[PDB]
Amino acid sequence: MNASSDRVFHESILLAIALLEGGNTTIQHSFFCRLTEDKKSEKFFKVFYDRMKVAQQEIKATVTVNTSDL
Amino acid sequence: ENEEKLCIKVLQTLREMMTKDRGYG
Amino acid sequence: QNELRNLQEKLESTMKLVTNLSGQLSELKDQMTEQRKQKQRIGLLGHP
Amino acid sequence: QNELRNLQEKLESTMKLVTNLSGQLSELKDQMTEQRKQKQRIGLLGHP
Amino acid sequence: SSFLHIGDICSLYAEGSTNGFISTLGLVDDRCVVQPEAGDLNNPPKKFRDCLFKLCPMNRYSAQKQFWKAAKPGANSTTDAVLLNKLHHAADLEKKQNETENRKLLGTVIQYGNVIQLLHLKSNKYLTVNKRLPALLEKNAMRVTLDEAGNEGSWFYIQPFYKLRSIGDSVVIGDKVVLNPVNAGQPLHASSHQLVDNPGCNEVNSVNCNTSWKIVLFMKWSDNKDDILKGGDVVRLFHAEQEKFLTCDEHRKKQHVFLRTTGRQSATSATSSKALWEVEVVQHDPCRGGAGYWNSLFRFKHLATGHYLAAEVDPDFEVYSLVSVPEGNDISSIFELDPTTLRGGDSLVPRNSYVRLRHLCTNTWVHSTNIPIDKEEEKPVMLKIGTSPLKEDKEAFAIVPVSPAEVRDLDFANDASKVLGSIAGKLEKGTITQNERRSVTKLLEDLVYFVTGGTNSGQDVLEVVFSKPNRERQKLMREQNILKQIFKLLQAPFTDCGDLRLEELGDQRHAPFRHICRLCYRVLRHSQQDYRKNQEYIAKQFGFMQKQIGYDVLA
Amino acid sequence: VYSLVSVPEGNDISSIFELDPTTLRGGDSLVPRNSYVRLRHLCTNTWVHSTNIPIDKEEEKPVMLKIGTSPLKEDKEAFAIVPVSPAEVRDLDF
Amino acid sequence: MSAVITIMQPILRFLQLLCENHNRDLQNFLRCQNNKTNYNLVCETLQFLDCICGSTTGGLGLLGLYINEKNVALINQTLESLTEYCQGPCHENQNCIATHESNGIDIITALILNDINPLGKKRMDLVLELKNNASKLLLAIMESRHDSENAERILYNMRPKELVEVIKKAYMQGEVAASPRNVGHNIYILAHQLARHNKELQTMLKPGGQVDGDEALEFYAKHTAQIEIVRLD
């Protein structure tokens, strides 16, 4: 929620990936219960949404390769 | 505060604590 | 009761066209208001 | 009969918006009546 | 209301350092020009058909840019019968689905902060800002051009100039706004560097300097319906009985009618230079015109020369005799038309309606007389038009519309004639510059696709479109004074060298010059497909086609 | 007709104003909270615009900027009506 | 790839693991957060897939120019996470995939009809995961719907040439889980699911006897079942 830089956010994401690990319904309940509080999820979903946005507009300008010849 | 390197070190320590297939016996 | 509601909406249709004739009255009100409007613009913008 | 009543209330809806356009005519009548009202109050209370 | 929707058409007016509407000079040329002393918002310039811009939504350019990248052979010259064909099909499908959402977004307000994609009305050409090319005059700037295909980079953020409004607020009509491209970051301003081609001509650049583009409206959305008269339509006034009437150039200006018919109808055309009028609605404002309403005090303007329809008294014989007045400010030139097959007084006059013209200053109905203007010329043709206070239902002439695609290429033919005339005049006195030598070339090879209707692909000597040569464009090349100018283009280097072709044969490094002398004869040949008037017109100039018959010029 | 001043009586007609909307709405639309307005001078029709000539011609670092008014209506000079909550005027008076 | 592109795969993995097996309340929390404003992450994921693989010029014939050996592990992850938003009958997460404003359905059904133009060495065993996971996504869109709109929206792109697709796929299976026959089984199940709304499609699945494609159609008709169950509600 308060990720200052990219390196902390990436390691926190990898920690959450290692923490969930497929079939732990006991701790998905914890994420759902924590996210149903008053006026705090708006930054969490925004930092998840802009990272979607700033990445999908990267490949539209950078990765434009056309191997038109054999 | 500044010096986030301690934070990434402790997160890496917790993550490598969580991993399987290493350090078992 | 169903037949009563049906005959009720037929006489609702009767006053529906009774209100429609006031609808043509309303557009009569329209047409002489634009008659007055064209008279006042031709008085204002046009010298004759 | 049920389908007849249903198509009856659709053309009731057609004249419903036909009466709605006279509703905007009615508020046009409103707006130039307050235009006349503001003209007469500015003639009365205000010297120019 | 009083808001700005997409689909509205409006002009832009710069203020602060240079005051003039944004315009484009010519139609072959691709520049934007503001004119400081031509006019202001109090009274607009006479050629107000230039300044109109139509609003649009965002247009996605994904497959189109891919096709433009892959269709230009850089080094490998790689072509594919499968890859390039599917790429072209994908680009066409993308353009079609791009167009199918423009009609969906027809009535929609716009707030400060979105891309706005300006479109020029009379040119059908988006104005773009390209990042690579700097401006020609001010050599620290970012040049603006006009692109027909809709280049990416014509997206414009709309951003408020006044601190009253902010992002998310809807734009009002008549405010001051600043426009900057989406990927240039340089707000589009009007410079103060005059051009050398025209006296009052300031170009438009894109730097960080500040300017205010006043959005002044011309015609509302949902007044651009194609089935009603508007304030900018070009129409030809066909008589209900005899023939269309027009304004031609005698020793002084007249308001006659051609007498000759040869079976004149509504569908057939006439000399499109002279018989074209544009409809103007007075609308109490100098701008803001459109949507005539059966009583809207119409005024007619001749298109070839700026002139207005009015009646002025003749030497009286015991309010008469419509003439051509060159100013449109007074009340002697304002008309009014009343219906035939009477309908309401606010019924938004339809497309091909038969009308009858009054003279609202002095109430005197228009009727066509039969007295000739010329009393001494054999086979008279010059039939004047009078007007009488007695209303008659016999003389009630119609409003035949003209599609925009015909007035557009009429103006293209006019501008091509002027450019060819100027270059042919410059060539015979002395050798033209390298840039003028390439500018005339491009006009010569797109004249071929103008007369044939084909598209630009390459390998210009293909000529497989010999099925329908689009006869109206051949007629436009005949009487818009183009074929006469091509003969001046070929005659000019003869006087340059002599005051000859074997001297050109002795040099044989004139391959750029032979490319502009072989294109002229190909253009001449493409005007010769099954058209007798062009055949006899060129055959009148048969005396010097055989002088240069077979050196290298493909004659 | 120029140079708005501070008159200590409110009975005459020289001190009555009129405000017209920005982003035009109806003439009886019950003007909202934080609306931007533009002030007339309904006695003598002369729209209010802010000038830049200082009142004090001799004081270092001038601060005293007078307000004029001109008959030419301009959309640039259109100032807003910022409300004040009653809890602030109440303890101001306290 | 850049650091802003390689950050997508852990984010998609974390979003996948958040609503993997169950708890559709948490699975519904990724499309509407009931605040003063909401962020639809499912449609944003579909838009990311559409732009990374397409966008609309991918479409019908040219798709192999955009998929190479480095883009495979990300497209598999994003469309697998896209399956995980619709696993289990979630009648609102399925409508956000097919009925939204961008054309993200034509691209998820493109990579099952035609093959991939680059034919590499370590890509025959790699494209089958794409085929399998895309077929499973198309199955997961319609778990138990029986509605017209999602059937016709998916069928708006395919023609009855998908029968030719599954027949051809079963025949070049014979040259010999990520297997070349199970994916054709998945498209057969999808076509069986789609036949209950189309009129023409059902007329040449069940009469397989008068069809030259004996092996594929009779094999997949023999090896498919159909049951009915009642849910807890």
Give the DSSP letter string of G205-232: TS--TTSS-HHHHHHHHHT---------
Strand E355-358 to E336-339 pairing: antiparallel
Q: CB of E173 within 8 A of CB of E167? A: no
**Sheet (strand E234-236) strand order:** E322-325, E307-311, E298-302, E277-281, E234-236, E400-401
How close E97 comes to chain G (CA, Å)? 10
- Token reading at G216: 């594929």
Q: What size, in residues, is chain A?
A: 70
Question: What residue type is assigned to position E133 of the chain?
Answer: L
Residues paired with residue E27 on neighbouring β-strands, in sequence order: none
Residue of C nearest to D2 (CA): C6
Question: What residue type is assigned to position D13 of the chain?
Answer: S
CA distance G59 to E89: 11
Q: Is G20 annotated as a binding residue?
A: yes
Token look-up 């030139």 returns E333
Residue of E nearest to A68 (CA): E78
G55 to E62: CB separation less than 8 angstroms, yes or no: yes
Q: CB of G164 within 8 A of CB of G171? A: no
- Token reading at G168: 């051809």
Those residues of chain A whose CB sits closer than 8 Å to some CB in chain G are: 6, 10, 13-14, 16-17, 20-23, 25, 28-29, 31-32, 35, 39, 41-42, 45-46, 48-49, 51-56, 58-60, 62-63, 65-67
Q: CB of E510 within 8 A of CB of E492? A: no
Which helix (H) or strand (E) segment holds residue F37: the answer is strand F37-40
Degrees to nearest 5, angle at CA E80 with E76 and E83? 115
CA distance G62 to E382: 66
CA distance E22 to E45: 11
Residues ≥6 apart with Cβ < 8 Å to A11 = B8, B11, B12, B15
- Token reading at E193: 């560097």
**First and final C-alpha spacing in chain A:** 49
3-state per-residue secondary structure call for B1-25? CCCCHHHHHHHHHHHHHHCCCCCCC
3-state secondary structure of E337: strand
Q: Is F21 exposed, middle or buried (0-12, 13-18, 19+ CB in 10 A)?
A: middle
- Token reading at G135: 């077929």
E70 to A69: CB separation less than 8 angstroms, yes or no: no
Residues ≥6 apart with Cβ < 8 Å to D34 = F27, F28
Instruction: Say which of E2, E170, E175 has its CB closest to residue F75.
Output: E175
Residues paired with residue E11 on neighbouring β-strands, in sequence order: E216
Closest CA to F3 of F68, F51, F64: F68
Residues paired with residue E338 on neighbouring β-strands, in sequence order: E356
Q: CB of E222 within 8 A of CB of E103? A: no
Residues from chain F that touch E16, judged by Cβ atoms under 8 A, are none
How close C17 comes to chain D (CA, Å)? 9
Chains in touch with D (≥3 Cβ pairs < 8 A): C, F
Q: CB of E179 within 8 A of CB of E187? A: yes
Residue of A nearest to G78 (CA): A52
Strand E33-34 to E53-54 pairing: unpaired
E83 to A69: CB separation less than 8 angstroms, yes or no: no
Best E1, E13, E163, E164 member to test F by mutation, with max F CBs in 10 Å, is: E164
Question: What residue type is assigned to position D22 of the chain?
Answer: S
- Token reading at E215: 């959005």
E87 to G57: CB separation less than 8 angstroms, yes or no: yes
CA distance E194 to E24: 15
Chains in touch with E (≥3 Cβ pairs < 8 A): A, C, F, G
CA atoms within 13 A on the CB side of E425: 6
CA distance E127 to E12: 13
Q: What size, in residues, is chain F?
A: 94
Residues from chain A that touch G4, judged by Cβ atoms under 8 A, are 51, 54-55, 58
Q: What is the largest CA-CA distance in chain F?
A: 48
Residue of A nearest to G24 (CA): A32
Residues paired with residue E323 on neighbouring β-strands, in sequence order: E310
G57 to E83: CB separation less than 8 angstroms, yes or no: no
Angle G72-84/G124-141 helices, nearest 10 degrees? Answer: 20
Instruction: Say which of G4, G14, G23 has its CB closest to residue A25.
Output: G23
3-state secondary structure of G155: helix
E63 to G61: CB separation less than 8 angstroms, yes or no: no
Residue E360 phi, psi dihedral angles, 5° rounding: -40, -25
Residues ≥6 apart with Cβ < 8 Å to G198 = G151, G152, G155
Which helix (H) or strand (E) segment holds residue E14: the answer is strand E9-15
Angle E532-539/E483-498 helices, nearest 10 degrees? Answer: 20
Examine residue G55 and say whether the peptide bond preceding it is cis (omega within 30 degrees of 0): yes
Token look-up 């050629």 returns E47
CA distance D9 to D16: 10
Those residues of chain D whose CB sits closer than 8 Å to some CB in chain F are: 31, 34-35, 38, 46-48
Token look-up 């849910």 returns G231
Residue of E nearest to F35 (CA): E164
CA distance G101 to E213: 34
Q: What is the CB neighbour count within 10 angstroms for residue D1?
A: 8
Phi-psi region of E407 (alpha: psi -120 to 50; beta: other; left: phi over 0): alpha
Q: What is the CB neighbour count within 10 angstroms for residue F87?
A: 8
Closest CA to E129 of E61, E66, E206: E206
- Token reading at E385: 């038009």
CA distance E142 to E129: 7
Residues from chain D that touch C6, judged by Cβ atoms under 8 A, are 1, 5
Q: CB of E183 within 8 A of CB of E160? A: no
How close D25 comes to chain F (CA, Å)? 16
Extended strands (E) in E114-197: 119-120, 125-129, 144-147, 156-160, 176-181, 188-194
Residue F38 phi, psi dihedral angles, 5° rounding: -140, 130
Query: For the range A8-15, what are the long-range contacts, defined as Cβ-Cβ under 8 Å and sequence gap of 24 or more?
Result: A8/B4, A8/B7, A8/B8, A8/B11, A9/A47, A10/G7, A10/G10, A11/B8, A11/B11, A11/B12, A11/B15, A12/B11, A13/G7, A13/G10, A13/G11, A13/G14, A14/B15, A14/G10, A15/B11, A15/B14, A15/B15, A15/B18
Q: Is E260 annotated as a binding residue?
A: yes
CA atoms within 13 A on the CB side of G141: 29
Residues from chain A that touch E83, judged by Cβ atoms under 8 A, are 68
Instruction: Say which of B8, B18, B19 has its CB closest to residue A11.
Output: B8
Q: What is the largest CA-CA distance in chain D?
A: 68
Q: CB of E231 within 8 A of CB of E280? A: yes
3-state secondary structure of E220: coil
Closest CA to E213 of E179, E182, E187: E179
C46 to E344: CB separation less than 8 angstroms, yes or no: no
- Token reading at D3: 């389908």
Residues ≥6 apart with Cβ < 8 Å to C35 = E345
Residues ≥6 apart with Cβ < 8 Å to G15 = G30, G41, G45, G81
- Token reading at G12: 């998609």
Instruction: Say which of A10, A42, A59 has its CB closest to residue G51.
Output: A59
3-state secondary structure of E277: strand
CA distance E377 to E381: 9
G14 to A16: CB separation less than 8 angstroms, yes or no: yes
Q: Resolution of the coordinates in A?
A: 3.3
CA distance E298 to E278: 10
E63 to G62: CB separation less than 8 angstroms, yes or no: no
Q: What is the CB neighbour count within 10 angstroms for residue E52?
A: 21
> Can you say how many angstroms the Cα of residue D15 is from the centroid of all Cα atoms in its chain?
14
Q: What size, in residues, is chain C?
A: 48
Q: What size, in residues, is chain D?
A: 48
Q: Is E351 annotated as a binding residue?
A: no
CA atoms within 13 A on the CB side of D10: 5
G35 to A32: CB separation less than 8 angstroms, yes or no: no
Q: CB of E527 within 8 A of CB of E474? A: yes
Angle E83-102/E63-70 helices, nearest 10 degrees? Answer: 150
Closest CA to D16 of C24, C10, C20, C28: C20
CA atoms within 13 A on the CB side of G39: 16
CA distance E179 to A5: 34
Instruction: Say which of E295, E331, E361 has its CB closest to residue C38.
Output: E295
Q: What is the DSSP letter of F81?
A: -
CA atoms within 13 A on the CB side of E342: 1
Closest CA to E219 of E124, E287, E302: E287
- Token reading at E147: 């692109």
CA distance E236 to G178: 72
Residues from chain E that touch G60, judged by Cβ atoms under 8 A, are 86, 90
Q: Is E501 annotated as a binding residue?
A: no
Residue G99 phi, psi dihedral angles, 5° rounding: -105, 15
Token look-up 């097919």 returns G98
Closest CA to E201 of E466, E56, E393, E24: E24
Closest CA to E142 of E183, E192, E196, E178: E183
Q: CB of G148 within 8 A of CB of G98? A: no
- Token reading at E114: 């979105």
Closest CA to F35 of F86, F84, F82: F82
- CA-to-CA separations, E400 to E235, E269, E282, E395, E513, in angstroms, rounded: 6, 10, 21, 16, 45
How close C40 comes to chain E (CA, Å)? 13
Q: CB of E171 within 8 A of CB of E4? A: yes
Q: CB of E338 within 8 A of CB of E356? A: yes
D25 to C29: CB separation less than 8 angstroms, yes or no: yes
Q: What is the DSSP letter of E257?
A: B
Residues paired with residue F68 on neighbouring β-strands, in sequence order: F49
Strand E33-34 to E277-281 pairing: unpaired
CA distance E341 to E353: 10
Token look-up 């034509």 returns G106
- Count C/E contacts: CB-CB distance under 8 Å: 16
Best E331, E333, E362 member to test C by mutation, with max C CBs in 10 Å, is: E331
Q: What is the DSSP letter of G202?
A: G
What string of DSSP letters covers E339-373? ESS---TTS--BTT-BEEEE-TTS--EEEEEEEES
Residues ≥6 apart with Cβ < 8 Å to G140 = G83, G86, G87
Q: CB of D25 within 8 A of CB of C30? A: yes
- Judged by CB atoms within 8 Å, which residues 1-25 of B form the interface with A? 4, 7-8, 11-12, 14-15, 18-19
Residues ≥6 apart with Cβ < 8 Å to G22 = A25, G88
- Token reading at G163: 């029968």
Q: Is E262 annotated as a binding residue?
A: yes
Q: Is G222 exposed, middle or buried (0-12, 13-18, 19+ CB in 10 A)?
A: exposed
Residues from chain C that touch E361, judged by Cβ atoms under 8 A, are 46, 48
Residue of A nearest to B20 (CA): A18
Q: What is the DSSP letter of E34?
A: E
E164 to F24: CB separation less than 8 angstroms, yes or no: no
Residues from chain B that touch A5, judged by Cβ atoms under 8 A, are 4
Q: CB of E193 within 8 A of CB of E214? A: no
Q: Is C47 exposed, middle or buried (0-12, 13-18, 19+ CB in 10 A)?
A: exposed
What string of DSSP letters covers D9-44? HHHHHHHHHHHHHHHHHHHHHHHHHHHHHHHHHHHH
CA distance E36 to E433: 30
CA distance G181 to G172: 9
Residues ≥6 apart with Cβ < 8 Å to F93 = none
Range list of H helices, E279-433: 404-429
Best F12, F13, F15, F24 member to test D by mutation, with max D CBs in 10 Å, is: F13
Q: CB of E63 within 8 A of CB of E87? A: yes
CA distance E184 to G220: 58
Give the CA dihedral G74, G78, G79, G80, nearest 10 degrees.
Answer: 100
Q: What is the DSSP letter of E202?
A: E
Residue E193 phi, psi dihedral angles, 5° rounding: -90, 110
Q: What is the largest CA-CA distance in chain E?
A: 84
Chain breaks in chain F (C to N over 2.5 A) after: none
Degrees to nearest 5, angle at CA A15 with A10 and A19? 150
Residue of A nearest to B8 (CA): A8
What string of DSSP letters covers E478-501? HHTT-HHHHHHHHHHHHHHHH--H
Q: Is E103 exposed, middle or buried (0-12, 13-18, 19+ CB in 10 A)?
A: exposed
How close D33 comes to chain F (CA, Å)? 11
